[PDB]
Structure formats: structure tokens, C-alpha cells
Assembly symmetry: C2
Homo-oligomer: 122 residues x 2
């Protein structure tokens, strides 16, 4: 959503339960058209950021099918707001956010993911 | 305190405000007698762990005056509970906990610090 209501933050906007064997979970976001991606915004659960992801690895796909890793996973444990800027703006149509298991929590709690950038004529 | 009331966690049990120039703040705990220290317990603000310390460096002093660093500072950002066990129990009379500035917070919030160990005849 463009702006969900963030005033009370009861439990979480979105929650994920982790199996003991797995540590990474991937959120694949498919855009209707390729955009000039510039910066990713990830907002964890602000009321209880124990469920904030330890590290996040972004992936971009210009054709929307070929997942390709972005950078090494930046550690966001203890961060109230995740801003992954790109020095080089990338033409991407699909974005895979692979979130790592938190340091001492088996659940992931997120509030809002933004996909900031431009278009070809915007 | 042995057990402070942790049921609501309104603001914090203890809070620290960070100057822009400094990044480390030291809590020096002086015991009346030297004890066989075994493990440190640090509880951050459980309701809002944005103020949890990014990294903590412990220091022990057997004579109580000569501060001497323990290990490299363990990163506790995103940890609801900090348990620094010692494989070698150390005879310590003073314990200096040097807490680092959080990743995106200018305040530190702690709830309870425990100093676990034995005595000479206990």
C-alpha cells in the first residue's frame, strides 16, 4: 500500500513464521512495467522491532524472470527504517527481497515496502 | 535491582542521551567484594528495543581499579536479551560495561543488569 495506517501498530501489518531449517524468506515483487529503480524502503514493525530482519539481500530483474543478487546482505538488525539506496539506478521490473531470520526471534514483522524510482518518461 | 517490575515498560528503567561526538558510554559496577564472575546479563528496553545498544564491551577488574577489556564488543543490535557467558570464570570485583551508540537511535534504554557468578565459599 502507498501509506497504510501507522498510528498504533497492534501486532504487525505482515508477519512471517520461520521453520527451524530455513533462514531466508524471499518476497518477490513483480511490477507491471520495468522502472528505473533508485532506492528500496523497508519498514519493519515499529512497535516491536525484535521481529525486524537481521539482514536483507535485494535482487533486481530487468526481464522479471532472471533473479540476480544485488549487493551483499546489509545488516538491518536494530534499524527502525531500512533505506537501500543505489548509486547506480537500475532498470528493474522484478525485485526479490530476501530477508534473513532475526537474531533472537522466529517471526518476521513488516509494515510497508516502497519501490522508489522513475519511469522512462517520468 | 534483583527483579524490577517488567510488566508494562512505559518508557525505560534507565535511559541515556548521547552527544554527537561520543559513541561509547561506560557503566562501572563496583562490587563490595571480588566474586567469581561467570556470565553477564543485560536486558534492554523490551517495549522499544530501538534503544538497545549496538555493541557491548565488558571489562573486568580483580582489584577494582585497573580496567581491562574483556572481549571484542559483541553486537547485540536486534537482541531482546544479552547473555555474555565466560568459558573461563574470572575473579572480578569491578565490571565496566561500555555500550555503543545504537544504529539509528540517539538514546539508550536498559531495564536490568545482572552480575552472575559465585563467591569464594558459595
Amino acid at each position: 500500500q502507498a501509506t497504510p495506517p501507522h498510528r498504533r501498530a497492534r501486532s504487525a501489518a505482515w508477519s512471517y513464521i520461520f521453520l527451524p531449517e530455513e533462514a531466508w524468506c524471499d518476497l518477490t515483487i513483480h511490477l507491471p512495467a520495468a522502472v528505473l529503480l533508485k532506492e528500496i524502503h523497508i519498514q519493519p514493525h515499529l512497535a516491536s522491532l525484535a521481529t525486524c530482519p537481521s539482514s536483507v539481500s535485494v535482487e533486481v530483474s530487468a526481464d522479471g524472470v532472471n533473479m540476480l543478487p544485488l549487493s551483499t546482505p546489509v545488516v538491518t538488525s536494530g534499524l527502525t527504517y531500512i533505506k537501500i539506496q543505489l548509486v547506480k539506478a537500475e532498470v528493474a521490473s522484478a525485485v526479490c527481497l530476501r530477508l534473513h531470520r532475526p537474531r533472537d526471534a522466529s517471526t518476521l514483522g513488516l509494515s510497508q515496502i516502497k519501490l522508489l524510482g522513475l519511469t522512462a518518461f517520468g
